[PDB]
Amino acid sequence: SSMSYSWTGALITPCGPEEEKLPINPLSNSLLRYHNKVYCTTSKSASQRAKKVTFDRTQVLDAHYDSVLKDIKLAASKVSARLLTLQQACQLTPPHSARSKYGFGAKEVRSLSGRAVNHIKSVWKDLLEDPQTPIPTTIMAKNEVFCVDPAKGGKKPARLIVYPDLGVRVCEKMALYDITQKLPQAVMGASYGFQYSPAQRVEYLLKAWAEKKDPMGFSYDTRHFDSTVTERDIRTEESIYQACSLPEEARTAIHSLTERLYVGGPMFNSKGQTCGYRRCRASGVLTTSMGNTITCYVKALAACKAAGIVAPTMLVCGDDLIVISESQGTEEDERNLRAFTEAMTRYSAPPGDPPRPEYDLELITSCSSNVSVALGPRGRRRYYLTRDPTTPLARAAWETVRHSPINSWLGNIIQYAPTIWVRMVLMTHFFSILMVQDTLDQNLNFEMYGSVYSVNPLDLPAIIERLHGLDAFSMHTYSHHELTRVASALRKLGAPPLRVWKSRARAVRASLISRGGKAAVCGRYLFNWAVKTKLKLTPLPEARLLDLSSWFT
RNA sequence: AGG
Ligand SMILES: O=c1ccn([C@@H]2O[C@H](COP(=O)(O)OP(=O)(O)O)[C@@H](O)[C@H]2O)c(=O)[nH]1
Ligand SMILES: [Cl-]
Ligand SMILES: [Mn+2]
Ligand SMILES: [Mn+2]
Ligand SMILES: [Mn+2]
C-alpha cells in the first residue's frame, strides 16, 4: 500500500557544527582508555538511516485487533480532557526548544511576549479553519553517543527527527497535552510502563511472575517503529483521542492536527530545501510517546489473542513490551510466539529480533534493561533493575567544548544505584572527580523522560535510600550474568577492572570521611562495599523527608 | 523534536 517516505535527493543537513572530540579528555581519561571507540551519530549518516526506514507497508487487520480496539475506545470514553490555554501551553515549552522561523524563540514563548503569543493565536485560528493543508516539517538527524560494535557493523546511523514549527508545537499542547496526561493510564492501567520507577518496574514484573502457576515471559520491540506506523494507525489514534469527553474546539484542532501533521506531510532540511514526504509517525510531534505506546498496546494485545497467549500481564513503554503469561509447555510456547510475531507483522509492527520464550526473569530484556538478583545484608534475595553498561560508559566519556559528561554519570548513578557497575565504577569516578575539583556541594542537572532535575551530590545517599531502599548500599554476590557482562564491558572500553576500582574506592571513601558532614555520610553509605569491616547502616532521617514521585511518572 |  504506502511507502513510509519518499525523497527528493536533498541531503539531511546539520543544524550547527557537529562537535569534535578533543585530543585529551581530562574528565574521563581516568575512567577508560578506548576513546577511539566512543562516537556520536552524525547528520551524514542520516541518509543511510533514511534508506533503512523507507519501505512499503501493507497492513492486514482482523477480528482480534477490531475487538481490542473496541475495548480501548470504551476505556477512553471514561476520560474527560480539557484545552490548555494558549498561555499554559506556552509555559510548557522547554527552555531551549528550537526557535520559530517567524523571528522568536523559546524564551519569548515562555515569557509570553506579545509577538509570540500573537503568532500562535493565528497558527491556532488557522488550525480551526483549515483542516487539510499539510503543515511543513523539518527533518534532522539525532546526535547521540554509542560505543562502536564490530559485530553490528561498526557505527549506528543517526535516527531521523521530524518536527513542525515552534508555533505549531505550542498549539499541539493546547489541543492534546491534557490527553497525554490521562489517556494512556486510562486505557492500559497497570500496563502503562512510564508510571514506574526502576524498583516499581521490578516489583511489578515479580508480582506478575509469581502470580502464574507456570510462568513464561518474552519481550518484543518493533524494527523502526515510527516508519511502520500507517496513515490508518494515525487516524485510528485520533479516533481513540476523540472517544474522550472533549470540548468541540479541541475536537476540531485534534482532527486538523491529525490530517495536516500527524498522518503525513512534506519535510524540509535545515537549509530549507524540500527533502521528502512522510506517511508515517513524525518522531518530534507531541503525540509521539502516547501514540507509540497506545498503538503498540493495541497491536500487541490483539497479537496475544491471535497467538493464544494465556493470562497475559503486559508492560508497555513506547514500542517496547514485556508479556508474562501462563506457559503452555515449551513446544506450544514457541509456536505461540511465532504466531505472535506473524500477527504483529500483519499489523505492520515487524520485530527487530524474533522474540523467544523465557522461563527465568533475568534473561528478559526490555527498554535496554533487565531484572537481576543479588544478596542483601541479611542474606535475603534482592531484585533490582540493571543493564549493559557499555552505552552508559561511552556516554560517560563524551567530552567536548560544548558538552560535559558529569550529568550523564549522575543520571546513571541515580537510576542504577544498586548495580555493581554504578557502585564500583561510576560512583567511584564521580566522587573522585568532584572532590579533586572541590565541587562536591555544587548542584547538577539530571535528565530523565524529557525533564531536568537539580540535585546536590551530597544528597545522593538520601535520594538513593528513597528510590531504591537501604539495601542498595549492602548488596553482595551479584549474578554470573552481571559479573560477566560488567567485566566484559570494562575490558571493551579499556577501563580498569573491578579490583582496581575497589582500591580506588577505598581512597575515595577515606577522603570523603575525612571531610565530615554530608560528605562523610556519602563515604560511609556509598562505599561500605569497599571495606572489610562493614558498618551498620541505619535508615537516614533525611530520606523520610523526601518525595520523588514526579521523577518517574 | 516530543513525552
Ligand atoms: O530519541 C527518540 C527515540 C525513540 N523515539 C520513538 O520511539 C520509537 C521506538 O524507538 P526504538 O528505540 O525502539 O528504535 P526504532 O524502533 O525507532 O528503531 C521510535 O521509532 C520513535 O518514534 C523518539 O521519538 N525519539
Ligand atoms: Cl537481606
Ligand atoms: Mn523499536
Ligand atoms: Mn477527525
Ligand atoms: Mn524500542
Alpha carbons A545 and A21: distance in angstroms, whole number: 42
A214: left (phi over 0), alpha (psi -120 to 50) or beta: beta
- Three-class secondary structure of residue A535 per DSSP: coil
- Closest by CA to A99, choosing from A107, A111, A90, A88, is A107
For residue A163, which amino acid is it? Y
Q: Is there an atom of ligand 1 within 6 Å of A465 CB?
A: no
Contact call for residues A257 and A167 (beta carbons, < 8 A) = no
Mark A276-286 as b/e (b = at least 16 C-beta within 10 Å). Answer: bebbbbbbbbb
CA distances from A303 to A231, A329, A349, A354 (A): 20, 19, 10, 14
Instruction: Kindly determine whether the C-beta of residue A96 is less than 7 Å away from any atom of nucleic acid strand B.
Output: yes
Cell of A372: 537481576
Q: Give the residue, out of A139, A140, A283, A294, with the most ligand 1 atoms within 8 A of its beta carbon, to mutate for a pocket test.
A: A283
Rounded distance from Cα A255 to ligand 4 centre (Å):
4
The neighbouring-strand residues paired with A381 are A375
A319 is in an annotated binding site: yes
- Three-class secondary structure of residue A215 per DSSP: strand
Q: Is there an atom of ligand 1 within 6 Å of A222 CB?
A: yes
Contact call for residues A46 and A310 (beta carbons, < 8 A) = no
Task: List CB contacts of A539: < 8 A, sequence separation 6 or more.
Answer: A465, A470
CA distances from A46 to A4, A20, A43, A159, A261 (A): 16, 18, 5, 7, 22
E strands, A5-128, in order: 5-7, 38-40, 56-57
Q: Is there an atom of ligand 1 within 6 Å of A318 CB?
A: yes
Rounded distance from Cα A165 to ligand 2 centre (Å):
53
Q: Is there an atom of ligand 1 within 6 Å of A481 CB?
A: no
- Three-class secondary structure of residue A374 per DSSP: strand
Cell of A439: 565541587
A320 is in an annotated binding site: yes
CA distances from A96 to A93, A107, A161, A166 (A): 8, 8, 16, 11
Q: What is the DSSP string of A249-264?
A: HHHHHHHHHIIIIIS-
Instruction: Considering all nucleic acid strands, name the nucleotide whose C1' atom is nearest to the C-alpha of residue A161.
Output: B1
Cell of A179: 490527553
Instruction: Considering all nucleic acid strands, name the nucleotide whose C1' atom is nearest to the C-alpha of residue A289.
Output: B3
- Three-class secondary structure of residue A16 per DSSP: coil
Q: Is there an atom of ligand 1 within 6 Å of A350 CB?
A: no
Query: Which residue has its C-alpha nearest to nucleotide B3's C1'?
Result: A289
Q: What is the DSSP string of A420-483?
A: HHIIIIIHHHHHHHHHHHT-TTS-EEEEETTEEEEE-GGGHHHHHHHHH-GGGGT-B---HHHH
- Three-class secondary structure of residue A190 per DSSP: helix
Cell of A80: 474527560
CA distances from A165 to A91, A101, A279, A284 (A): 16, 7, 18, 11
Residue ranges of alpha helices (H) inside A212-287 are 225-228, 231-242, 248-257
* Vertex A204 angle, CA A448 and A183, to 5°: 60
Alpha carbons A449 and A273: distance in angstroms, whole number: 32
CA distances from A243 to A78, A179, A180, A246, A254 (A): 9, 11, 14, 8, 12
Q: Is there an atom of ligand 1 within 6 Å of A319 CB?
A: yes
Instruction: Kindly determine whether the C-beta of residue A295 is less than 7 Å away from any atom of nucleic acid strand B.
Output: no
**How many Å from the CA of A545 to C1' of B1?**
36
The greatest distance separating any two alpha carbons of chain A, rounded to the nearest whole angstrom, comes to 73
Instruction: Kindly determine whether the C-beta of residue A192 is less than 7 Å away from any atom of nucleic acid strand B.
Output: no
What separation, in Å, do the N-terminal and C-terminal C-alpha atoms of chain A show? 38
What is the DSSP-derived secondary structure letter of residue A272? S
- Ligand number nearest to the C-alpha of A474: 2
Q: Evaluate the CA torsion angle A177, A178, A181, A184 in order and state its sign.
A: negative
Alpha carbons A332 and A136: distance in angstroms, whole number: 49
Resolution in A: 2.2
Alpha carbons A320 and A162: distance in angstroms, whole number: 21
Alpha carbons A232 and A291: distance in angstroms, whole number: 12
Give the count of alpha carbons within 13 A of A226, CB side only.
Answer: 21
Tracing cell 535510600 back to the chain, one arrives at A465
**How many Å from the CA of A92 to C1' of B3?**
12
Instruction: Kindly determine whether the C-beta of residue A268 is less than 7 Å away from any atom of nucleic acid strand B.
Output: no
**How many Å from the CA of A524 to C1' of B2?**
41
Alpha carbons A77 and A242: distance in angstroms, whole number: 8
Contact call for residues A371 and A385 (beta carbons, < 8 A) = yes
Alpha carbons A504 and A173: distance in angstroms, whole number: 49
Task: List CB contacts of A84: < 8 A, sequence separation 6 or more.
Answer: A92, A173, A174, A177, A178
A126 is in an annotated binding site: no
Cell of A161: 527527527
What is the DSSP-derived secondary structure letter of residue A222? B
**Environment class of A246 (CB within 10 Å of its CB; exposed 0-12, middle 13-18, buried 19+):** buried
